[PDB]
Amino acid sequence: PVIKVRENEPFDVALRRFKRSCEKAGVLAEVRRREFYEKPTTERKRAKASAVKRHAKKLARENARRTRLY
Amino acid sequence: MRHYEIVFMVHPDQSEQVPGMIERYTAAITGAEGKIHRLEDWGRRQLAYPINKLHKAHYVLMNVEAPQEVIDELETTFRFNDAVIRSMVMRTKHAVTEASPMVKAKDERRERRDDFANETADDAEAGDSEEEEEE
């Protein structure tokens, strides 16, 4: 959660980018769930198909770059 | 026969009672037409966690060519010995043509690369002296 740190008694230094171990972190996917040998890579491709709002904006950035129209 | 390398450990109380052991093991392997390709003492080392409720133990390394039944017999003897407190064994191995190559990394473990559960100052007065210009 808070690690040990180069930070000045962090609650006052607005670092947020790395400061978890499990807590909304990627290892929470089989933590508090069954084991599933296959699921977690299938579940990237499946999640993304419904996650269309982020998908389509990255898709638009790269195809518009790729045409020399950007 | 096969080329080997062996690590083993004994207590801190036994870190000056190990040379009588290194004699006996040598004489077992030379007794078997086997040879010492390298010999090193890593001394008392601090442990990232205490083994048998003590934060240090004393490490040794032998590197040999020996018949496989010597090393069958001896790895199991250690695994039944209570003074010999942990080992690792590796198959198909030789020494470096450098002398003391692992000693320079012993020096590094004892300095920067453990969690020092008992003080650095008592365990570092053990085994091979870290003459870093040989190794």
Partner: protein, 74 residues
């Protein structure tokens, strides 16, 4: 001319030549986190073949109780 300026563990024969060993604990310190975890290929400047060798040496050294293996210790 001969020889030209090589990249990290690249273009050359006498670096990373043999497998990355667990006794060479001095190199292993370079490649581990502050919780004693392995660092991947994408950061170390090495390929799949070397990473397999690195992650083995790190493992070996940790089960020898000589290297950190979590943020916690006693």
């Amino acid at each position: 001319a001969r020889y030209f300026r090589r990249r990290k563990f690249c273009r050359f024969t006498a670096e990373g030549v043999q497998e990355i060993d667990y006794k060479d604990i001095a190199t292993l310190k370079n490649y581990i986190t502050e919780s004693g975890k392995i660092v991947p290929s994408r950061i170390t400047g090495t390929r799949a073949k070397y990473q397999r060798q690195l992650a083995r040496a790190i493992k070996r050294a940790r089960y020898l109780s000589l290297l950190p293996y979590t943020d916690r210790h006693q």
